[PDB]
Amino acid sequence: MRDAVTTLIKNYDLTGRYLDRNAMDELKAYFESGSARIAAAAMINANSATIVKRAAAQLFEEIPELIRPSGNAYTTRRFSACLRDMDYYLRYASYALIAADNNVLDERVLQGLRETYNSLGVPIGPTVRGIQIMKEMIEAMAEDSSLNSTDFIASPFDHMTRELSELSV
Amino acid sequence: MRMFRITACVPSQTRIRTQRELQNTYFTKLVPYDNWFREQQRIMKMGGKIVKVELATGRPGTNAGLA
Amino acid sequence: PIPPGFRPINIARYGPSNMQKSLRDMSWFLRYTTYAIVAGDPNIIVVNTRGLKEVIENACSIDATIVAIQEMRAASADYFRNNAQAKEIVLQYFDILLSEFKAPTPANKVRQGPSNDIQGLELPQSYFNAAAKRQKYAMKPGLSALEKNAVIKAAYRQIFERDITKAYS
Amino acid sequence: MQDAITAVINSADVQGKYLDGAAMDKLKSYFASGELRVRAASVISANAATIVKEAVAKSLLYSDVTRPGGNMYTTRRYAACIRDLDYYLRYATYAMLAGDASILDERVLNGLKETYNSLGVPISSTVQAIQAIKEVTASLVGADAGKEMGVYLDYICSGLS
Amino acid sequence: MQDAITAVINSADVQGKYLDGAAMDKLKSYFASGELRVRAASVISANAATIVKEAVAKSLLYSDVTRPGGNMYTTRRYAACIRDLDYYLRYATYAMLAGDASILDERVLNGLKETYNSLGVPISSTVQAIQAIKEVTASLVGADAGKEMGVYLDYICSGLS
Amino acid sequence: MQDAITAVINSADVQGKYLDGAAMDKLKSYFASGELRVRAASVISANAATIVKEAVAKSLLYSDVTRPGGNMYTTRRYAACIRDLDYYLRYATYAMLAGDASILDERVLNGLKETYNSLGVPISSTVQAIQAIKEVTASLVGADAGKEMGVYLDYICSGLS
Amino acid sequence: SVKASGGSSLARPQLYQTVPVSAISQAEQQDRFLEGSELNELTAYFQSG
Amino acid sequence: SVVSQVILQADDQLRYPTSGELKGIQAFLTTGAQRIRIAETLAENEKKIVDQAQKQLFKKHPEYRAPGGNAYGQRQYNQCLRDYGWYLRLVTYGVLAGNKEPIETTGLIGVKEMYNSLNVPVPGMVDAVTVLKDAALGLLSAEDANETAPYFDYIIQFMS
Amino acid sequence: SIVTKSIVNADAEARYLSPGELDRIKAFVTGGAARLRIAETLTGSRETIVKQAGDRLFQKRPDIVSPGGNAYGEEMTATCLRDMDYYLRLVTYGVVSGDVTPIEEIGLVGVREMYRSLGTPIEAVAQSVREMKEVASGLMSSDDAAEASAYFDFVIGKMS
Amino acid sequence: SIVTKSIVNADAEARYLSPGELDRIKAFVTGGAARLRIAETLTGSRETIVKQAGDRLFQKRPDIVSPGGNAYGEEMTATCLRDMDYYLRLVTYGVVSGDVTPIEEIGLVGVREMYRSLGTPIEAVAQSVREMKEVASGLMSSDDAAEASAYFDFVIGKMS
Amino acid sequence: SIVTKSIVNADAEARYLSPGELDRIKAFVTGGAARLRIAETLTGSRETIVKQAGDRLFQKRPDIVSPGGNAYGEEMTATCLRDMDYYLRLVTYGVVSGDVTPIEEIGLVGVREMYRSLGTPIEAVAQSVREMKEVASGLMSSDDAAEASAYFDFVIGKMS
Amino acid sequence: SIVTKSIVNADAEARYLSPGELDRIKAFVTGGAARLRIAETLTGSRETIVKQAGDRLFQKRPDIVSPGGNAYGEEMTATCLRDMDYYLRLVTYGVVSGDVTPIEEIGLVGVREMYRSLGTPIEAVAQSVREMKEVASGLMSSDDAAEASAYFDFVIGKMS
Ligand SMILES: *[C@@H](C)[C@H]1/C(=C/c2[nH]c(/C=C3N=C(/C=C4\NC(=O)C(CC)=C4C)C(C)=C\3CCC(=O)O)c(CCC(=O)O)c2C)NC(=O)[C@@H]1C
Ligand SMILES: *[C@H](C)[C@H]1/C(=C/c2[nH]c(/C=C3N=C(/C=C4\NC(=O)C(CC)=C4C)C(C)=C\3CCC(=O)O)c(CCC(=O)O)c2C)NC(=O)[C@@H]1C
Ligand SMILES: *[C@H](C)[C@H]1/C(=C/c2[nH]c(/C=C3N=C(/C=C4\NC(=O)C(CC)=C4C)C(C)=C\3CCC(=O)O)c(CCC(=O)O)c2C)NC(=O)[C@@H]1C
Ligand SMILES: *[C@H](C)[C@H]1/C(=C/c2[nH]c(/C=C3N=C(/C=C4\NC(=O)C(CC)=C4C)C(C)=C\3CCC(=O)O)c(CCC(=O)O)c2C)NC(=O)[C@@H]1C
Ligand SMILES: *[C@H](C)[C@H]1/C(=C/c2[nH]c(/C=C3N=C(/C=C4\NC(=O)C(CC)=C4C)C(C)=C\3CCC(=O)O)c(CCC(=O)O)c2C)NC(=O)[C@@H]1C
Ligand SMILES: *[C@H](C)[C@H]1/C(=C/c2[nH]c(/C=C3N=C(/C=C4\NC(=O)C(CC)=C4C)C(C)=C\3CCC(=O)O)c(CCC(=O)O)c2C)NC(=O)[C@@H]1C
Ligand SMILES: *[C@H](C)[C@H]1/C(=C/c2[nH]c(/C=C3N=C(/C=C4\NC(=O)C(CC)=C4C)C(C)=C\3CCC(=O)O)c(CCC(=O)O)c2C)NC(=O)[C@@H]1C
Known part of the structure; x- marks a missing residue:
């Protein structure tokens, strides 16, 4: 598993280069953004159950056939799953927000997600819609709170939707 | 192959979280010499207590003729 | 029969959509009760009513649900009322339904990561209540010959994926 | 383990004779009691959480062992203890349905007393929990099935003590 | 385990000395008796089941152990008993090929007395069975190989007793 | 295990009360000492092989235990002994960083004495070897952390003796 | 997207248990034919059906 | 503590503790004065915290005082206040240790089936711990409140 | 023993008895009178079988x-x-128990190495239990002898 | 990195990041400027150190x-x-990452087998890294020298 | 020894010795006179060789x-x-025993840890026992040197 | 063969073959003419023995x-x-192989289940192989008779 520091070190190791001023600038930018990343992760630490509950309470009204029969979120066993x-998605999004790199999402979320969801009949479109609902909720809560930097919040959710989503065009 | 007669109780530290079936944590075991160091380290890192251990297999101090 | 503390719910104060949810929940409770009657195992009721109290208590009255399924049991019993050999099945299935529904949500099963490389996981305690549990074979020292040979044969099936002492001695 | 039927088969087999009159009418007694045993097992399987709930309610709550310094204080200790009592109810149900007490020293009384001594588990309060689980089961199912349930629960407490 | 050459090599290694004549005399004795041991082991492996069946016929059949209520009555029990007997024969063959009884008093007699005392197996009857095996092997393979077998077999008897 | 900082937490857990000043001052003393504890642990982590090498060189070298006839004569016994000394140094490092000997009481003092009695390991040789561990660590770090290391090594002495 | 696929075979989770599924699964996991207990469960359930 | 964490990780990896872990131990040993200050002020002023905490809890959820609840009797009321005080006590212990480990090993593992057996609603008790967090956050100073908030947040996460 | 296999399978699955299994125990208890009727008819006519x-x-x-x-x-x-x-006694034991579990407990397994050590033809022992089977079917009523033959054919299948 | 270790330790027990891990990551972030200065002076003096x-x-x-x-x-x-x-570059990578896992993953797994195949004395390679430690520690302040010598002594311990 | 390894294979496969390995033990017994002759001349020249x-x-x-x-x-x-x-004594022990098992279980496994704790160069002691095998092959006859050189080269391989 | 056994064991232990197995292999290689002679004797008398x-x-x-x-x-x-x-052909295979592995892998695994199905008496099959042993031993020289009868009694011992 790689964070931003680890992937920069791996990129420089591959070319066999010492860390130059561009690498120092990237690490410097990560270190000054780290306080805001810690603040955002500590924010979503507190509210996480409310985020996933309201994410379900918005997703199952945008697509109401998930809770009708023949939907995949029908029974309460499927609902709890x-x-x-x-x-799971919010926890790994917290991990990616701390790490400032989406390799944790790739390695531990996305590499078999289409395989599992196609095996169990789980939809991918409503799933990534729930991802974007969670992203909009965390962005709105960060805008409401005293967060100076809110640009990095949308990055792990957008990466997850791009990686998991079927290629339309 | 020289071995040990051990007797130990190792409670599960994760059974409450995992909600699995129960086993008797106390047991009398025959364990080989080559695996006994790793087995003992596993017991002490899991938190169990080895309450009895004897060299029931082989003679103590045998220089040759081990396995 | 036993109303603990319930208050009747006003339709206009409760709202239209919540009333539709309540009506489909009542019809769905009766539908799964009939399905469990057909199946001969209340496992469907146990799985789909064990964790339902915490999700349903946020916007619906839990005492009203208890009195509702109480009236369902009473109405089904009086309308059926054939004989004691066929009424106690419906009575005990409704008792299982009310006990599982009043039972609060158990702890989700947490699969710990064995080391740093492997992710730790969680599984709700409704998924491991219908999914064809493995038979656990434990060699107690005092066991009789039949179950001892069963445990030995199960161990051979586990290690060699088949019963080699039966197939080839 | 064995049963009433397996017990009388073995107790005829140790002299190697066929079924005598005493075996026949005690198996008649077993078959006469069997429906009551299945009804008692069914009702405690249906209510099985609540019997342990009332047992810990009038046994171990508001007690010095629940107070700090005891072995009921910590919540992991509490969860382990109520899981143990649920397992005791399940194995007592197994003994009651089987009609013989060999399943207890087969499965639960293999090493329970001395591993409880190793973990510092209070045997006296555990026996008090067994007396509580006895009286709650006897209140739920009645005197007739409750007495023969309490036979195997006495076997549990005597093996543990 | 420890055969004759590793035994004398360990006796030399404890004193930290090269092999001298005081162990090489026994080493020459072992190499002189080696082909006798191999041919006797070949004969015993040829007649291994027949030795067991004549031994149980001359020592164990028509006794109180194979009467009902005895210690050899049921079919699983008889299969286990003949399994023990040809285990003793095969491990005695192992020790006879090795030249020492380290394998016999270790990988057979580690807890055999304690497990037979816990089960209730008659130690005297097993000793009589081993003596029957010794008589059959002595009458079947010869005098010198027979007494070489008998040394390890009454070593097994001393381990059981 | 449990640290020095968690020791007063566990004591207050047993007492059912909050932190009192007789534990507050001990916690402040641990906070005052912890930087020199963690740095001395870092130093012996950097030089960890040298402690084992010098302890073997000045305690166990050229002795009856390592000459022929000794329990540490053979290369396997030497490798096992230096592995045991490395584990002793690592767990002593763990204790001197942690402020408590519970790691030694649980993960070393469980059955080490009984295994050494089973193997015939010389207890007095191990006691003078851990005295050599004390001398090398006190020479490497200095007596200010040397006596602190010697407290847990004397705990090892009392447990193994 | 993801640069490799581990394979997607069909998964069939058992949504709920019935008496024939329980009896046949109990025989199948223990690698036996339907003996007297499993046939008695099936007989009683089929008569009550 | 975090000291227990680094010894457990080092013993699991079969090695001595390494440099970043040692520097984290140095940082924790530095901040221990702030930890002991937060613990002592919470210990001395726990009573007002549990006072308006239970006031806000039973204002928000008027069903345990009501018929059909679990806090009719004064004995159950005192046990609920005892649970509140024990949770604040474990919060002080975990603030002292620097990590979640005392709260975990004493009050959080198995707590959901623990109150399943006692019929106390777990979301009701996470509402209780949130209003207890609100009382403690209001009572403590701003940097101390920012230090002590994620422990309460972890209790919210693990309970629900 | 059906109840033995009930307890063993319920303990392996680690839960209480399902209602279908309880109905099985009802069916076995109700058929216990018929199987002991078959048992006492067999032990009345035991010697003519032999x-x-x-x-x-x-x-x-x-x-x-x-x-x-x-x-x-x-x-x-x-x-x-x-x-x-002895084998007729084991057949009566299996009939009165409702399953072949006590037959395997006393004698149904180990018989092959038993008769190999004794020199006894196992197929002739199987054929022996075969004429035990149709002599019992001749003397006792065939619709009610289907139950006894249901263990007789398992015995001859194991010794075949 | 320290961030990687904290996320991995949280994810292994399947929870969000603990307050102890947040404090550790905060200490990592605050020490990032000093660590970047140490790595900068090492990579600036990389030729004269070697x-x-x-x-x-x-x-x-x-x-x-x-x-x-x-x-x-x-x-x-x-x-x-x-x-x-190469080893000085790996030391700079470890200084940037705040721990020893890049040095471990790149140049300290299989180093003994590699240098045994090469025929190179691994104790002399450790002596070379020790001389790099001394020369680099002479080129910084005392705390910076201790912080870099932590990673250097890790390389010493892995080589010898 | 080769006899104890044969019986270890025999009871690992849980049956009597194969005729091939019985004739193999016969071949070992017949050659043991020649191995003992090698033992006599080596223990006679135990001083001058070393x-x-x-x-x-x-x-x-x-x-x-x-x-x-x-x-x-x-x-x-x-x-x-x-x-x-000691190593010459071990080679004579292996020539007597017929296998490299006594060298392995006395002084050949763990020799890396032995000479790592001693600081002794493992390639230098491998060169020393290589000179031992060259002087031994010089002093032996051709067949005896060919017999002993395989065990000597096993010592070279496992101590290189 | 013994080559296959030694290579398989060394592969399972992940090591090269020691000289303690290599001398066994070369002894089996050198002592092959007698087994070859017994093999052509048996395949010359392959009909009349049967x-x-x-x-x-x-x-x-x-x-x-x-x-x-x-x-x-x-x-x-x-x-x-x-x-x-068939079994005479397998005996010739084992003779020319110097090992029991061809008989075991071709016509000894599953023989008990096979003849248990087919109803053929396994002790009479053992008697058939024993009678082939007696006819072959009468037909050939005494040491060669013992060598062939070694594999023959292995076959009848695996039969019974
Ligand atoms: C007659 C048609 C068949 C036959 C039988 C036969 N059996 C024996 C000897 C023994 N059989 C047993 C087996 C058992 N004993 C038990 O208690 C049980 C389970 C209840 C079994 C299966 C035993 C132990 C013996 C030994 C005698 C003894 O009981 O002590 C013989 C005698 C052989 C002898 O050499 O004495 C015979 C003749 N043989 C056949 O060929 C028919 C198939
Ligand atoms: C209040 C008196 C009534 C009520 C209303 C209500 N229902 C929902 C939504 C859900 N209802 C369920 C129930 C079930 N799951 C099952 O598997 C079964 C059969 C055993 C049932 C009956 C579930 C899972 C939901 C959530 C899915 C969804 O959003 O529709 C709500 C909304 C909850 C909210 O907005 O937070 C409400 C208000 N339920 C009752 O039981 C009473 C009849
Ligand atoms: C409850 C009545 C009292 C009591 C219980 C208690 N037990 C433990 C620990 C364990 N108990 C068991 C029990 C079993 N082992 C078996 O083999 C079986 C039969 C299947 C049973 C029932 C086990 C395994 C443990 C270890 C924990 C685990 O889950 O693996 C504890 C915890 C001790 C601790 O400090 O962890 C307790 C508290 N003690 C009391 O005070 C109650 C009155
Ligand atoms: C037969 C000579 C007498 C007899 C004995 C008897 N044995 C058993 C069963 C067992 N036999 C052993 C022995 C060994 N197992 C090994 O792995 C080894 C080393 C090669 C030995 C020596 C053991 C351990 C048992 C225990 C259970 C098992 O089957 O493994 C029994 C059965 C006990 C029971 O019924 O549970 C008996 C009765 N009894 C006699 O009367 C003969 C004289
Ligand atoms: C000589 C070929 C090379 C070498 C030798 C050297 N040896 C030692 C001392 C010891 N050597 C051993 C090793 C063994 N002892 C055994 O019993 C066995 C198995 C038979 C072995 C392999 C031991 C244990 C010692 C220590 C002495 C003791 O027993 O106490 C030294 C001294 C080490 C020191 O630092 O003092 C030396 C120098 N060194 C070379 O350069 C030669 C190539
Ligand atoms: C060295 C100071 C002295 C000594 C050591 C010695 N130890 C052994 C073998 C073992 N020691 C242990 C004990 C432990 N188990 C653990 O988990 C730990 C760490 C906490 C220890 C210390 C064990 C299990 C063994 C067996 C090795 C294995 O299981 O693989 C030996 C070897 C004994 C032999 O070869 O028979 C020796 C020599 N003895 C001395 O004389 C030195 C003074
Ligand atoms: C108060 C916030 C809520 C609530 C409380 C309530 N609690 C009990 C009983 C018990 N509470 C505990 C608590 C703990 N055990 C631990 O290990 C820890 C952490 C250290 C805690 C906090 C225990 C052990 C008990 C049982 C002992 C006893 O009852 O004396 C009750 C009583 C249950 C009953 O019905 O008798 C109640 C009511 N109820 C609420 O409504 C609040 C949300």
């Missing part, structure tokens, strides 16, 4:  | 009573018909 | 560069200085 | 007796010759 | 050819003599 999946 | 199976065996396969076989004189045949009585 | 430490190594151990030695010859001497520059 | 091999070792590698080597001093060279005497 | 041993079996135990027997029928007796030819 879907909420556990949303908790 | 004698008719023995002399029908000696007329169908006369090799063993001839020299070269295992049945010499009187005492070998006495031990053989004692074994026949 | 030059002076190689000179001190070849004066203290002439056997490795005498004929018959592993590094005898100008090409093998340049290869030895290239190895020293 | 003295000439030590002189060859110090002539090949003068850095052992030079400053900077491990064996500097009369007692150090005496212990080096004592180690060579 | 004919005489089949004649001896059907005269000793006429229950095999009795009505109701397993081999009642001319094609059944032809397949019985074909099975005797």
